[PDB]
């Protein structure tokens, strides 16, 4: 997160960190046994880290659970990044509490202009490199489709939306992928891709969650 603020420990209790010897992506706890991340975040031998704040220090609110299975969306297209969503089942159920809660799934699509919350342990620089150890937050609005398409001509699909600032300065970045875009207490997006970070006229591109609720629900019920 570029140009954001320090969330504060356990202020985003549905936020998870995906670890494979190091943090490589984010995710969101949707229930006690399932996390939703980005399909491009797929990898094997993943451990899920809950209740985290400083990912480099055990502060005592954490739960570390291995994934038992991962299911990438049947139509994920790694070339255009269409359908950038994946489901991960925990080896054992998380213990939900104050610092460790799930996030509600949308029942409808959010509209342009709506203010959302984006969080991650991603790079903190548009140019350069500086990774935070603590969770960073950003408030940003959903840009109109027409604005989205003017920014990335020929690349935005119906399962994507842009959020952020056309002037740049504030945005999600490398290390934030898989993480949540939350609006009106619902998970509406998933950090996906972009052109650099926080660049002028190059806002962030997110997975349009609302278009997947059914597949989510069905998938979870059968596994």
């Amino acid at each position: 997160i570029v140009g954001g603020y320090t969330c504060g420990a356990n202020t985003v209790p549905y936020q998870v960190s995906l670890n494979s010897g190091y943090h490589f992506c984010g995710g969101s706890l949707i229930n006690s046994q399932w996390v939703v991340s980005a399909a491009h975040c797929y990898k094997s031998g993943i451990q899920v880290r809950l209740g985290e704040d400083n990912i480099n220090v055990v502060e005592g609110n954490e739960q570390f659970i291995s994934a038992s299975k991962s299911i990438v969306h049947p139509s994920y297209n790694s070339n255009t990044l269409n359908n950038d969503i994946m489901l991960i089942k925990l080896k054992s159920a998380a213990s939900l509490n104050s610092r460790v809660a799930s996030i509600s799934l949308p029942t409808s699509c959010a509209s342009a202009g709506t203010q959302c919350l984006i969080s991650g342990w991603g790079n903190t620089k548009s140019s350069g490199t500086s990774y935070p150890d603590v969770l960073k937050c950003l408030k940003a609005p959903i840009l109109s489709d027409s604005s989205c398409k003017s920014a990335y001509p020929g690349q935005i699909t119906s399962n994507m939306f842009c959020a952020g600032y056309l002037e740049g300065g504030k945005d999600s970045c490398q290390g934030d992928s898989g993480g949540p875009v939350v609006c009106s207490g619902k998970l509406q997006g998933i950090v996906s891709w972009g052109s650099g970070c926080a660049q002028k006229n190059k806002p962030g591109v997110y997975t349009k969650v609302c278009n997947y609720v059914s597949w989510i629900k069905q998938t979870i019920a059968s596994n």
């Binding site: 980005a38 790694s78 690349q155 490398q174 290390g175 891709w193 052109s195 962030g204």
Partner: protein, 58 residues
């Protein structure tokens, strides 16, 4: 540096060619339109169009 396995081209004289290769961390210091993912490590694609593409890699 610039090279290209998957290359796509229109069948025009001359062709407008692009590379459908997905590289890691960055895009060539010979690319004008580099788009990457927000994870670590990032996956990028160079969407520039050219009257040709580059040669294989490896």
């Amino acid at each position: 540096k610039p090279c290209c396995d998957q290359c796509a081209c229109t069948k025009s004289n001359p062709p407008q060619c692009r590379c459908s290769d997905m590289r890691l961390n960055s895009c060539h210091s010979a690319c004008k339109s580099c788009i990457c993912a927000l994870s670590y490590p990032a996956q990028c694609f160079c969407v520039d169009i050219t009257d040709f593409c580059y040669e294989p890699c490896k």
